[PDB]
Design a protein around this ligand. Structure first.
Ligand code: HLD
Ligand code: HLD
Lengths: 491, 500
């Protein structure tokens, strides 16, 4: 393969056998990495600063040329890429909300890439289009919505699913904006928690509302929206002659893992006529658990829901859906031409085509890996896996609730797998907060140098840099949590 | 290896499930390798067509419904063969239905590895290699466009439609940064301009972004589908007279239907005179920048403030692979930044300037770079050049082989500029009836009928569509390296056979 090039593989005539050997060579590298991902002897990452890779590692050239490299150099390039990347499936990877490597998911991804099609029409993605309609119906059933209505679409990340929801609310109340622009209607105000995902502020900016019109709702000790602050903010907007029309309730915040009081928010929405969107990008996996779905009570009253199977459900990146209670809103919002005008020429039912309801034109197949994982595990498989991660987080919290070297960020029992805490060097004082702020980056830097484990840290409001442990990986066990809690104390 | 009694719950992470995990994955891979083999064989159907009810009802064993309980790993493999059995062979030599076709083996291997890495693009911390591969590739793309090797910007996006949305957001932020905090209502009526034949993504973004589709003004095209620059200059002056503020034009370097290229040089002169952002939508035409022979169709791109380019179109990269390129650095960061403390911490161990996630409209972002970088290393620029050149030569061959012929009719009088060849099949009964409105209405039925019969045999696939006052016409398009001259002859022979 050191004398063989890409030009030689299929489509080149007679390239069938070399293509299979090449792909089986690639798969051998992938398998060894898969085998090592579940092996605790392997580092989570072999850390290197950007300059150390740009200057090039011992035989790893990132630069591009006019000349093709050989098939053996391609295999070497593949091995090196994996050698210097992060093991996101590692049982000790706790850096992100998305962690682990589902084997069914990976098999699903591999098939999807082989099928290499576009979601935008039933014409070229028949099976995937049907699978999406099926899955989005089930997701809506689990949310608690009646089948009398309901819609949705998979989007390239929860940030875009959130964007869709704002576009949907605005079109429902102010369809004049699509044709005439945001200046053709009154000042529109939208509400979100002070601890919600920054995607609400970005969609506000992108969509023409201005971030000044994205109002932050005060949070209590446990990082949950105070309903009386939300109601007060609505009336302040109305008193100013502005139009409040949307609220993002976060079901499982990125940092504390808090759940907003959906029911108390929905009661206020009913009363003042606001779209209720629920960002369950992180909390959504708990809907699969009969034990934990109560944290999302009220979600059945929501107008839309963002849900990321790629977070707690362990679907490989990206897998995000926006569910909309009222069908026809995404279509009316996004259609650049009405109807049913695509017919009666076409060989198939064009109402299956999603180009018109999407902000995207071309769209990646994200459904197959998720549909496949649902077939392989069942709703019961997701249920038990989510419950295990939540039990592990209950364990970590109880092990460090009063430990000397550890201090809890907020007063409350975790609602999700998020456990927020500081590592105390010895010790409230403003000078102490300045000292404490430097503890987590220091340990994190050392964690990256060691490659033993990965955990995120971040400040919040006036609170100093604090560790935020999160659990979404089926491979993470009690011993790994013990190792991580001992690794923080050791460093 | 028997999987009748084995379930997903027994695979890794489960202890001692390693051997069964590897066996299962190799069995999935064998199914994909068999599908890969069949892809490049012309006797295999492009698509085994089924109406939704047949697939929803359950195709002998294939149950699309989801349940409380798991299926065995044998049933999983059965679902994998069935998924592929009922989908389109997008890499098939005779698949000409879309702009995005083909099955690139290096691209395929790149995606399999990308999926194995299963990471996000937002930070250097969790995607060190890909972040750097993206930097290097974007820099090379800016150089090919004709911009500086030092100054420049860009990011990968989930489709060209979004790359086009980035351009408008960047254009708006540049001239009206007040919009970010204050909203659209704080500035005068902003006006966008685009071709009558440009991608609908300009209208959709204008709607989404708060401009209003009334403020996305369509520019007149000549018989060749190119913007008439005097109509554009006139529209800028019309908006100005009304007190509206023109600030952006989308010049299309390669339309989806005609494959027409907008006169960028002339447009850029108008932009310079009236101080307007120039965006070039090269999502489809971008691949010709790789060709020394064809890159002149994009002359003037060097003057653009932004460029959308989809390597997933002409360059055969597996979906999705689209880049927004921006000439002036800082516009993407300034426009999109929100400064999330949980994602983009400024006190990290490494140089944070490499955390590029706060210049995107997305938070989480799929890795689309690896498959493209790997194909570039395996093909070289010469490989892409050769491949682009071969499709264009196939397109020229198609044109000449039908242009004179009595059984066909060319939609517009002009040489195709891209691989798009637009024509009508003329049934015996319509030859040689003079062009009348009643002849148009009869001709309009021909293309759908032919396509419906094409779906019954599944030998080929080609899109048709009307345009303006023109009846439904075929728009042949070539981007698959697997398509050859005999595949072109087969398409004309099939259309003719089906037309009779
Ligand atoms: O995709 C992820 O894993 C992810 C997404 C976030 O928005 C935030 C985080 C995080 O704070 O670690 O992770
Ligand atoms: O990625 C594609 O295959 C694609 C994208 C389009 O916008 C339009 C078309 C088309 O008309 O073939 O295809």
């Amino acid at each position: 393969f050191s004398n063989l090039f890409a030009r030689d593989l299929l489509p080149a005539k007679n390239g069938e056998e070399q293509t299979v050997q090449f792909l089986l060579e690639v798969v051998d590298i992938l398998l060894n990495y898969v085998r090592k991902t579940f092996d605790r002897s392997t580092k989570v990452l072999d850390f290197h600063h950007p300059h150390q890779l740009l200057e090039g590692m011992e035989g790893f050239n990132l630069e591009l040329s006019d000349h093709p490299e050989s098939l053996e150099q391609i295999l070497v390039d593949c091995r090196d890429t994996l050698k210097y990347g992060v093991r996101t499936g590692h049982p000790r990877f706790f850096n992100q909300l998305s962690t682990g490597l589902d084997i069914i998911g990976l098999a699903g991804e591999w098939l999807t890439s082989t099928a290499n099609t576009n979601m935008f029409t039933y014409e070229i993605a028949p099976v995937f289009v049907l699978m999406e309609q099926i899955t989005l119906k089930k997701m809506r059933e689990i949310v608690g919505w009646s089948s009398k209505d309901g819609d949705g679409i998979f989007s390239p990340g929860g940030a875009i699913s959130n964007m869709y929801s704002i576009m949907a609310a605005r079109y429902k109340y102010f369809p004049e904006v699509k044709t005439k622009g945001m200046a053709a209607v009154p000042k529109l105000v939208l509400f979100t928690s002070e601890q919600s995902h920054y995607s609400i502020k970005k969609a506000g900016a992108a969509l023409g509302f201005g971030t000044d019109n994205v109002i932050l709702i005060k949070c209590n000790e446990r990082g949950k929206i105070i309903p009386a602050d939300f109601e007060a903010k609505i009336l302040e907007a109305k008193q100013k002659g502005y139009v409040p029309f949307y609220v993002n309730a976060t079901a499982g915040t990125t940092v504390y893992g808090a759940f907003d009081p959906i029911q108390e928010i929905a009661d206020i929405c009913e009363k003042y006529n606001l779209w209720l969107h629920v960002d369950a990008a992180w909390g959504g996996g708990l809907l699969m658990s009969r034990k934990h779905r109560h944290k999302l009570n009220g979600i059945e009253r929501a107008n839309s829901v963002t849900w990321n199977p790629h977070k707690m459900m362990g679907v490989l990146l990206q897998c995000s859906a926006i569910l909309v209670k009222e069908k026809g809103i995404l279509q009316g919002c996004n259609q650049m031409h009405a109807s049913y005008l695509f017919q009666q020429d076409k060989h198939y039912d064009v109402s299956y085509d999603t180009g018109d309801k999407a902000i995207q034109c071309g769209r990646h197949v994200d459904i197959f890996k998720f549909w496949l994982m649902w077939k392989a595990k069942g709703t019961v498989g997701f249920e038990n896996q989510i419950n295990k991660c939540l039990e592990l987080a209950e364990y970590l919290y109880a092990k460090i609730k009063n430990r000397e070297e550890f201090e809890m960020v907020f007063n409350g029992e975790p609602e999700h797998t998020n456990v927020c805490f500081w590592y105390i060097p010895q010790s409230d004082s403003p000078q102490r907060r300045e000292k404490l702020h430097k503890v987590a980056p220091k340990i994190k830097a050392l964690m990256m140098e060691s490659g033993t484990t990965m955990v995120g840290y971040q400040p919040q409001g006036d609170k100093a840099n604090f560790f935020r442990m999160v659990i979404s990986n089926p491979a993470a066990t009690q011993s790994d949590i013990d190792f991580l809690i001992e690794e923080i104390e050791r460093l």
